[PDB]
Amino acid sequence: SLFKIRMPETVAEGTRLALRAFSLVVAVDERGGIGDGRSIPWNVPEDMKFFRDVTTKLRGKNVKPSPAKRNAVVMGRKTWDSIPPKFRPLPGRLNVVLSSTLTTQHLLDNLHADSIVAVNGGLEQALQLLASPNYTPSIETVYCIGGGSVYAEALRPPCVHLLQAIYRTTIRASESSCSVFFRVPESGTEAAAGIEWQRETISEELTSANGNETKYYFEKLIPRNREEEQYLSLVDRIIREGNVKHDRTGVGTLSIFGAQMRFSLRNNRLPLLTTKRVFWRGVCEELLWFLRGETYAKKLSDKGVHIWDDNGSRAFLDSRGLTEYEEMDLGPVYGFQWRHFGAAYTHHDANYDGQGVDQIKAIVETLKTNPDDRRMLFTAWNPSALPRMALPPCHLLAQFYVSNGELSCMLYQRSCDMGLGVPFNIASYALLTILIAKATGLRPGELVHTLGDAHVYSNHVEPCNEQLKRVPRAFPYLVFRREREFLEDYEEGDMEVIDYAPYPP
Amino acid sequence: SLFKIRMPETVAEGTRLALRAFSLVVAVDERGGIGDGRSIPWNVPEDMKFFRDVTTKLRGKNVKPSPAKRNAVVMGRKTWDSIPPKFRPLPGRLNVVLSSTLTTQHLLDNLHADSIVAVNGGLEQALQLLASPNYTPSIETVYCIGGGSVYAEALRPPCVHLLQAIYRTTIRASESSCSVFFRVPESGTEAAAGIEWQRETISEELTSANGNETKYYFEKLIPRNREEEQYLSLVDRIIREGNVKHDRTGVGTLSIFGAQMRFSLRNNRLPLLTTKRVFWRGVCEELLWFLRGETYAKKLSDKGVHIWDDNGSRAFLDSRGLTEYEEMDLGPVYGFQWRHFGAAYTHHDANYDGQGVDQIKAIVETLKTNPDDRRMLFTAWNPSALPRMALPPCHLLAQFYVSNGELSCMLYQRSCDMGLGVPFNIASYALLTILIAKATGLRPGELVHTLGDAHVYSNHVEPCNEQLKRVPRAFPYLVFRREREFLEDYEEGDMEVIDYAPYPP
Numbered sequence A, B: 001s002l003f004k005i006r007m008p009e010t011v012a013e014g015t016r017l018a019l020r021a022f023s024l025v026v027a028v029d030e031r032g033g034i035g036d037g038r039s040i041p042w043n044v045p046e047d048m049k050f051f052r053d054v055t056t057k058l059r060g061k062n063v064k065p066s067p068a069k070r071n072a073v074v075m076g077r078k079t080w081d082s083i084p085p086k087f088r089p090l091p092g093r094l095n096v097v098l099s100s101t102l103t104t105q106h107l108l109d110n111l112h113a114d115s116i117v118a119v120n121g122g123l124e125q126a127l128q129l130l131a132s133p134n135y136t137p138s139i140e141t142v143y144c145i146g147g148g149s150v151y152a153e154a155l156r157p158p159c160v161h162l163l164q165a166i167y168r169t170t171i172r173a174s175e176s177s178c179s180v181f182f183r184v185p186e187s188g189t190e191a192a193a194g195i196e197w198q199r200e201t202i203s204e205e206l207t208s209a210n211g212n213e214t215k216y217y218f219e220k221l222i223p224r225n226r227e228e229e230q231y232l233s234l235v236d237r238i239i240r241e242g243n244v245k246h247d248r249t250g251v252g253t254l255s256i257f258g259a260q261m262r263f264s265l266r267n268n269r270l271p272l273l274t275t276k277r278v279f280w281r282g283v284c285e286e287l288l289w290f291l292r293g294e295t296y297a298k299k300l301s302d303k304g305v306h307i308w309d310d311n312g313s314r315a316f317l318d319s320r321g322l323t324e325y326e327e328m329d330l331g332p333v334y335g336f337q338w339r340h341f342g343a344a345y346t347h348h349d350a351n352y353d354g355q356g357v358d359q360i361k362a363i364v365e366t367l368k369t370n371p372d373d374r375r376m377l378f379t380a381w382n383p384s385a386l387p388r389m390a391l392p393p394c395h396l397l398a399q400f401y402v403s404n405g406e407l408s409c410m411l412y413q414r415s416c417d418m419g420l421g422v423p424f425n426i427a428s429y430a431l432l433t434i435l436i437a438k439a440t441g442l443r444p445g446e447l448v449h450t451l452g453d454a455h456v457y458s459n460h461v462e463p464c465n466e467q468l469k470r471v472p473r474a475f476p477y478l479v480f481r482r483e484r485e486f487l488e489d490y491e492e493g494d495m496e497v498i499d500y501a502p503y504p505p
């Protein structure tokens, strides 16, 4: 007992008050107008249906959204009025109206069902409230539905940065008399705020069954994800240009040598790959495992994480000359080296308190006292210990760096499978940083990822081409439901990763 | 004794028969023509003087070129004839005429002085012969002076790649009747062979004191050095965008976090920076020092290398809590960790044979037997040894990789001074690779350089701006005058770095 690493008092100076990411639904005329002062000028029933369906429907199979798992819509006061009483409140969804004249009760009235909440501030507060401990597991996607004033805030920092998709219905009607305006800025413009907007989908031109045979079309717009895209263009480069190589088993690979990647961890954005679902539950579970200096791999198994299972079998241990290790015991691997570098190993049950160099601790120590130190790095690559290990480490090195009170972290990895190894490990180090940040009272900055031998497996090739066809969506956020007294005492339950919107596992 | 690493038998399969790099002098009309069949059409006396001076004059101060240190000109047979007997042979220079009809003696005739050599092949053989053990220290720059046939070979692989500068005199004369042609290809064209040609200098338009008041101008053309340029654009990025930081002494720095560089080591090209002269003699001396697992820093001092001098003083050792170490003893630093990782240190004189993990050896071992291994990496970052060291390592990690029978090598460095640290270290690892290549019977490939904290010192800033004004020239070549029985037994004398053409120290 301690020995452990003790967490600081408050959250990091000028810190991220946990927000929620959102999506925006809007209809415009060709000029980009939304409603002549109050309300809306045109009448397209097809938009209404398309509105209903976007706002209601959850991810997955035919899963009716009960209060226990549902979607939420955010609107200003004027719009909430604008909705006809026959469809008020909006069914299936959590009507969220911001107001500074009316309260939650003050709005409830025909009668009488509690699917609404009024909020005292703007969009930020909504997102804060929606990301708040109870609302978060229950509420899947947030949608902003208008109007002008609410949209203004959406395309303004720091909302615009939490803005993750725009569904935009264009109406082929035209007059000048429509007052307010909504234009998505072109990329690389001042108004763009450095965001790059792309078409993800776009419907046919369609004609409305209303009174004027008026044309309309749909389109989904997403904020281009350079970060994830660099990962992909590395995969493509390997496939096109990699050297054919053959590993220890004998499987064929394509590999390149030496590359570098970066990912913003700012405001707990978390680079889980969109183009393919990552095993976050395992990621998180394994790293906390690492952080304790753990070794008995069945701790992971017991918790439904089966990866060290292959390398933990009686067979493989023996195949690696580890007679004396009981099944699922790995020796001085990763985390052990992290916390007790150079400590002589015997078995996993054995007490390792005080033996060997506790790198992580000393790092946490230096960070707080002396941020400018060019020596804050831990290693798992111990030549003397390597033979006693079930597996030499891939991610063998990490160096920390601090600027503008933000913590960055370079990770070095000698052998990198883009297939799953890599995306997994990116998430893994992203978490470490965020945690270490939290432990040293700093905001998180960048993860820099340096790859040694980067490879794709011979089987993986064609699969990977399927992945390369997809566009990367925006990244999710790590948010803490709870904090702990000691870093070591953190658990998967304590955090929850919000707004992860991938494509199939 | 051995213990050591034993060198292989022959040189690496399909290997670089040591060549010399050269420069090209040529005159053209505006159409790019050089001489109507045999000889030259126009008469410009100013070209002749400019020819004389380029071909004769050595680098440095008023140093008359004696046979002991001089310049060499390479010409085909027809040109050697073309020279009028009153200036034959060309004075101050080693007239080198290739022929397959006439020999060295066969050409000597008025009479009678031995400043010439005939060669049986083309330009390659010339360069080979000029880089040959005796001719190399003595002969400073090689110039190719024509004609058509010799120029053809110059702009052809693999000469064009050893081609390092073109001095081109343009004559503002015009007819069609000039037969042969000389055009430098535009960059990114087929004919360019992937080389990018740039103007380094260009004179005034000038009028010849000959019979027709004919115009002419000069210009120097160099093959753009992307490689070195990446180093520079990193320096500029730091200066423009680096975070102000303050190191352990207290000096001010500008730093960035995490970057990556590459350098071709192919055919023993050696990335010594042109934009500022590097201390090669020290580089080479220190790395061989490393390679032996050496520690008594005075071995370097004795050999006129004073860098470990500051960190080796009685003072600094004491300042680092090293009472027991005699002056100029550093503890388990760099090379020691390389050769005896984890060996318990006592003093430099003490025998360390057989103790600790000999990384380098095992690497050399694996390379030969199993090139596809993703584990060939040595480290100097030993947490248990760090406190006993006078200095923690900057270059703490190197991983090797083999493709197409070429050896590449990634180097990881945690703290990087662009001022001198970096350029020095690039050369340092380039040498290691070349040597390790030689030890494992492989050709050398790429050095990949990964920088952690990259910085420029507060003083260094303005100096560095002066450097940034320069254009990087082409890189030099490492060539071996002699080989050794064991890797350890190599010496600075054994090799000689040819064609290093910088700007002031």
Ligand SMILES: NC(=O)c1ccc[n+]([C@@H]2O[C@H](COP(=O)([O-])OP(=O)(O)OC[C@H]3O[C@@H](n4cnc5c(N)ncnc54)[C@H](OP(=O)(O)O)[C@@H]3O)[C@@H](O)[C@H]2O)c1
Pocket: A025, A026, A027, A028, A033, A034, A035, A037, A038, A039, A040, A075, A076, A077, A078, A079, A080, A082, A098, A099, A100, A101, A102, A119, A120, A121, A122, A123, A145, A146, A147, A148, A149, A150, A180
């Ligand atoms: N074409 C389309 O798809 C599109 C979409 C939606 C709506 N529209 C239309 O366009 C019109 C635009 O009008 P609008 O923008 O004024 O509508 P609105 O968004 O519904 O009205 C904003 C109201 O929300 C509350 N609010 C906003 N920010 C707040 C804050 N920071 N703190 C506390 N309360 C806050 C305020 O009510 P309190 O007075 O109570 O404080 C405020 O009056 C709407 O009437 C709508 O019908 C068009």
Ligand SMILES: NC(=O)c1ccc[n+]([C@@H]2O[C@H](COP(=O)([O-])OP(=O)(O)OC[C@H]3O[C@@H](n4cnc5c(N)ncnc54)[C@H](OP(=O)(O)O)[C@@H]3O)[C@@H](O)[C@H]2O)c1
Pocket: B025, B026, B027, B028, B033, B034, B035, B037, B038, B039, B040, B075, B076, B077, B078, B079, B080, B082, B098, B099, B100, B101, B102, B119, B120, B121, B122, B123, B145, B146, B147, B148, B149, B150, B180
């Ligand atoms: N404008 C300018 O600045 C410029 C510069 C220089 C010259 N020029 C003129 O342009 C003309 C071009 O004619 P050119 O190109 O035929 O002249 P050249 O280069 O002097 O003649 C080539 C001769 O060199 C020997 N040689 C070349 N390659 C060889 C090889 N691979 N192995 C053995 N021997 C080799 C051959 O002599 P063997 O028969 O003995 O084998 C061959 O005939 C010259 O006459 C010159 O006056 C113009």
Ligand SMILES: CN(Cc1cnc2nc(N)nc(N)c2n1)c1ccc(C(=O)N[C@@H](CCC(=O)O)C(=O)O)cc1
Pocket: A025, A026, A027, A047, A048, A049, A051, A052, A055, A079, A082, A083, A084, A087, A090, A091, A144, A145, A146, A169
């Ligand atoms: C005034 N208002 C806001 C409104 C209207 N059209 C939009 N159209 C688009 N594309 N995006 C929006 N932001 C949007 N917002 C309204 C008006 C009617 C209903 C409405 O009838 N609600 C039903 C629609 C059912 C139906 O008519 O089919 C629902 O279930 O959502 C809601 C919001």
Ligand SMILES: CN(Cc1cnc2nc(N)nc(N)c2n1)c1ccc(C(=O)N[C@@H](CCC(=O)O)C(=O)O)cc1
Pocket: B025, B026, B027, B047, B048, B049, B051, B052, B055, B079, B082, B083, B084, B087, B090, B091, B144, B145, B146, B169
């Ligand atoms: C035919 N030939 C080859 C020749 C002539 N002009 C050139 N001009 C240029 N720019 N580049 C060359 N390749 C070149 N080559 C010649 C002709 C004369 C002399 C010559 O008179 N040599 C004296 C020149 C002394 C003088 O005339 O001032 C010397 O010292 O180099 C040499 C080479």
Ligand SMILES: O=c1ccn([C@H]2C[C@H](O)[C@@H](COP(=O)(O)O)O2)c(=O)[nH]1
Pocket: A247, A248, A392, A394, A395, A415, A416, A417, A418, A420, A421, A422, A425, B374, B375
């Ligand atoms: O965290 C990990 C663990 C394993 N691997 C994969 C990639 C390589 O194929 C292999 C590395 O093991 P060796 O090649 O050195 O045996 O494991 C990773 O990419 N990341």
Ligand SMILES: O=c1ccn([C@H]2C[C@H](O)[C@@H](COP(=O)(O)O)O2)c(=O)[nH]1
Pocket: A374, A375, B247, B248, B392, B394, B395, B415, B416, B417, B418, B420, B421, B422, B425
């Ligand atoms: O091979 C070397 C040796 C030293 N340094 C310089 C750069 C840093 O300023 C300093 C590293 O030492 P610390 O900052 O960790 O004390 O030494 C290098 O760049 N390369």
Ligand SMILES: [Cl-]
Pocket: none
């Ligand atoms: Cl329906």
Ligand SMILES: [Cl-]
Pocket: none
């Ligand atoms: Cl009102």
Ligand SMILES: [Cl-]
Pocket: A314, A325, A326, A327
């Ligand atoms: Cl067992």
Ligand SMILES: [Cl-]
Pocket: none
């Ligand atoms: Cl003169």
Ligand SMILES: [Cl-]
Pocket: none
């Ligand atoms: Cl002839």
Ligand SMILES: [Cl-]
Pocket: B314, B325, B326, B327
């Ligand atoms: Cl002493």
